[model samples]
Each structure stands twice: as C-alpha cells, then as structure tokens.
Target chain A: SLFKIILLGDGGVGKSSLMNRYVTNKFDSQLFHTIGVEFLNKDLEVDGHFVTMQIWDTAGLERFRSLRTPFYRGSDCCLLTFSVDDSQSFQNLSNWKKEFIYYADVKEPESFPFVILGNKTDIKERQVSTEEAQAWCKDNGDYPYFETSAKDSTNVAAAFEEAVRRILATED
Target chain B: ATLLYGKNNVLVQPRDDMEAVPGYLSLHQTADVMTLKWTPNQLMNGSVGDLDYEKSVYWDYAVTIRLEEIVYLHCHQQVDSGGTVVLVSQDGIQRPPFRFPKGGHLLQFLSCLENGLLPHGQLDPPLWSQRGKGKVATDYVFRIIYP
Candidate 1:
C-alpha cells in the first residue's frame, strides 16, 4: 500500500529545500514562499516492496494554524523538522507534537509513525546538541530521531529512508 | 487646509504616522478611479573628478480590469534587471494572476489610501552580502469600492 507522508515544521527550517532535494536532486538558493500547500510524489522500494510516497508541504505561517487539522487527516506518517541553529524552532518541537496529537487523535500513538528531524546541522553555530535532542526523544516514548543538514545533503537520505522503514514496520 | 500645494502639484500630507507610505495607500469610497505611483532607487557613482548621479526611470507598466472593475497592474522591472510586480484590487474579488520571472523574488504590499495593491522587486535574501547592496521588493493589494 502507498504511504502518504507530510512534512511539518516552522517556516524557514529548509522544508522546501529538503523536498526539492528529494524530488529534483537539486536545491535553489532562492527561497520560494509557499502560500498554503504543495506536494511531491516519489516511489521507493523498501524490503522488496514498492511503496509510493506522497509528500505534502504546508506553509508554516500562523495564519495556517487552522489548516493543521485538515492536513493531518489521512496521513500515514509525518516528519517534524527543526533547525538546530534556531533554538526557538527546536524548542517548538513539543508544540508541533502536541498539535499533531490533538488534531490527528490517532487511537494508538505508537502506531502513528513520528520522526523528529534536527535539521540544518551544516550550521556550525548550532546551539542544540545531539545528546540533548536524543534524550528528549527518548523521554517522549523513544520516537526515532535524526540530525540532518538539508543544505549539505548530509544524512538526508538516510533520515528519510529510516522514516520510511518506521512507517512500513508500523503497517506490519 | 489638509492639502498642501507643491511647485505644481497638490500634496496630501497625512495627519499622523498612519499617513506614511504603506499605511496611507488605500482605496477610496469610489473604486472606479485607481491611482498608482512608482518610486525609483537612487543611484550614486564615486569618481575623483566628478560625482555622477543617474536619474531613476520607471516603465513596463500595464493594467487590466476584471469583473467589478477590479484592476490588475503588471509592473516589470527596468532594463537589465529581472523582476515583476502584480497588483490586484482586494475588494474580495478573485485573486490576481501574476507570474514571477525566472529566479525573481516577489514582494507584495497593500495601499492604505485607496486600499490598492502594489508589487515591487528587491534583492534575493542570503545572497545580499555577495552584491554588497540590499534592495527589497514591495507589492500591494486592496479592495474595490462600489459607487
């Protein structure tokens, strides 16, 4: 069965860049402002099973607060991203998780595949630490976590692959 | 009087800070009459013998009207530059149709006086240090008033 994935995060966390790199294998220096919602589709074979992935990117504006409920509907998995360099953004991970849980209201929280992405690792001035981030995730039911750099393309593929694996495992 | 007369024109100086650029630009009770203006960037040149200041020029302007006399302004950047501005009347009408040129950034703004829309161009972010000059674009959208 095809899995639908959604990328949610604060604006300017390189969500578009990550999606562009995944779909087009290239990144544009110019950041295009996403108004409401945009989507990307790709096919990946995991565990010898072909799984089609539909990725949705949403605007991070406060005006889009109402959209979270509708966007979370029917999503098989969600990737929550935060820039390590931006401390406030990283701190908002809890709020993002809370909103997702409140809106999606999944019967089984464990079955809902949630991936915590600590992005923008290429920024050497990052204040957040891997140990700190990992500990937080572990405290929150051990949700899978990855430190990635969308700009450097560092660990992006691995992180995405791991997310896919987690979702597939949940289906089993 | 509220209106001040200049050399050959009448100037309406706003009473308060709200009369400033963006805040003062708005639609009037009568929407049929749409007003537009363009302010150019100042140019300066460093030379030993003489100082050179190039005059600013504004062109590539077009306007179209949709239902309810909703005006759409197409403002293209000057020669040798790539930027476009699309201004549409808000008035709860359909969203204006505008396209950004390749590698161009879109800056939108709204006028407080006539409640009109204006669009302009500026330097793309992150690449600001490379050019040593930062000029951001501005655009606007406002509502239409029925007679």
Candidate 2:
C-alpha cells in the first residue's frame, strides 16, 4: 500500500531537511531547496502490513504554487510545517490547509489528516510559544503537533511515525 | 500566418532554421497510449528520441488535459471565473490518483462549470474569505517557462 505524505510550509522552514532526515537518516547543512515536486519513498512494516510512504517535497516559495497544487492530489497525510523562529510561518498554517483541501479535492476537508510540525525547535530565536501552538492545535480539532529540530534529527522520526500511525488508523 | 499551428513556445529565434524552435515537437493520442515527439533541436544533436507509453501501468496527468477527455486533475481548486492549465502527466502503480485548476486552459470541469472551484449548494460563493477559515482573497499566479 502507498501512504503518500506531503510536507508543506513557507520557505526557510526546514521542510527539505526534515524530509531528508527522516527518509535517509542523514541531514546536510547545505541541502538545497526543492525545485518543484521531489518524490521519495520509504518502505516500512506497520502492524504486519507492508506499506511505502511516498514522501513528496515542494518548493516553499509561492512561485511554485502552480506546480505544488497539482502535486497535492491524493495525499493520504500531510505535514503542515512552520519555523519555530518565524511567527508568520506559524500563522500561515491555515493558508496551507485551505490550499491542500482545495487541490487535494478532499472529500471531507474539515477532518482531513494533517500533522503540524514546528520545526527548528533547537533554535534560541524562537518566536511562537509552545503553549500558543498547543492551544491552536487544541482549538483546531486537536491536531497532533510536534516540535522538531531536523538539524539534529530531533523528533523528526516521531513526527513521521505519528503521521503513519494516524494514516493507518484513519484507513481502518 | 505563423500562428496557424499557433503556439509561441519560443521567442527571438536562436537561428534562421525553425528546427531550433522545436517545430518537430508533437503529441498524438491513440487507443493505446499518447505519443510525444521531439524536434532535432529539442532532442539529441542529430538523433531524435521518441517517448514510450506503457499501457499495463497506471499514469497520472499533471497539467495536460486532452481536449477529447476529462482529466481528473490534482488537488487545486477552479473557482467561479478562471481555470486555465498546463500539460503534465506521469505513471502510478495500482490504485488511482486525485485536484486543482491552473496552467492548462484547454479543458473545463463539469462540476465547477456553473459554480467554480468552490462549492455552491444553495447560496452564492463568497468573493471574500470567510471569517476564521484562513482563506485569503489574494489571487495566485506563477511563471511557467524559461528562455
């Protein structure tokens, strides 16, 4: 089975690094921004069921919005990302969600499976408070939120694993 | 007129010969598969290659919508007014895929025809974003090609 997952956020939110870290267990300080839509796959056994998580990364800059929207089709799960140090990125999560629903043509857009990642948690220049983020999630249908530092591979695996579990549960 | 086979894919001709303009670029759809051909300039220096179509496999169309067919495009919305799109397609494994309207203007969505990208059941679709829904009324546009 294919558990196609997508990572979406504004530029400088470390989406590329987070995906690369989780997929290969390797992180590069010089990892470049994605050009359009880059497809990556990881084979995992979930609850005795063999599944492949088709990970897709999009160009964070809105110039690639044209291409990214088409790429959002049929995604089983989505990781809506934001930078810990950038409050604007955090605030833009709702925009990303609406875009995903509009494009994915989600049948039930309200309850679609979305996992929020507050990336760059290792930074001291953080802007959004943990309580603030938690409250937002709590208010927004209790979406799962994770604080991650893809640079050191912190919570990166847990974030993805949580998404996979959610996908499985939703499917069942 | 130069616009008969009208598509200005290039500008400021690189040379006298239109071969550099990809005049040999072509698309043909048959019962089995779609065929795409490259011009001399668009292909190898002298050896033009042909695209292969695999029928046993599943493919997804990115932006390209055949005039004779209805493409179930990606997750993008086609609201009340504009649709337009570009051609994009690829292969998938077993099950099918899914939305959006952009780039390619060749086709129309039967669902969005009378309404648009958003749903309108009993009321008019708002020209503005609803309160607290995170929608922005700002229009989205992007660049499509290179020199």
- TM per candidate comes to 0.55, 0.55
lDDT score at residue A123, model 1, on the 0-100 scale: 86
Chain B TM-score of model 1, please? 0.22
Q: After superposition, how far is residue A85 of candidate 2 from its true place, in Å?
A: 0.9
lDDT of 1 by residue, B45-126 (tens): 1111223333222112122233234444444433434334444454644432333333222222221222222122112221
Q: Indicate the docking level reached by candidate 2.
A: incorrect
Tens-digit lDDT track of model 1 for A1-172: 7687878888788887787677667766776444435455578888787887877776665555663456677788888888898887888888887788788777886668888888888889988888988998888768889888777788888777777888888876
Report how closely model 2 matches the true complex, as a DockQ value. Answer: 0.02
Task: Give model 2's TM-score versus the native structure.
Answer: 0.55
Instruction: Put down candidate 2 lDDT per residue, B15-134, tens digits, no spaces.
Output: 356322322222333432333322222221222233433321112221233322322222223555333222233333221211121222212222222122222121122223252122
DockQ of every candidate: 0.02, 0.02
Interface RMSD per candidate: 19.9, 13.1
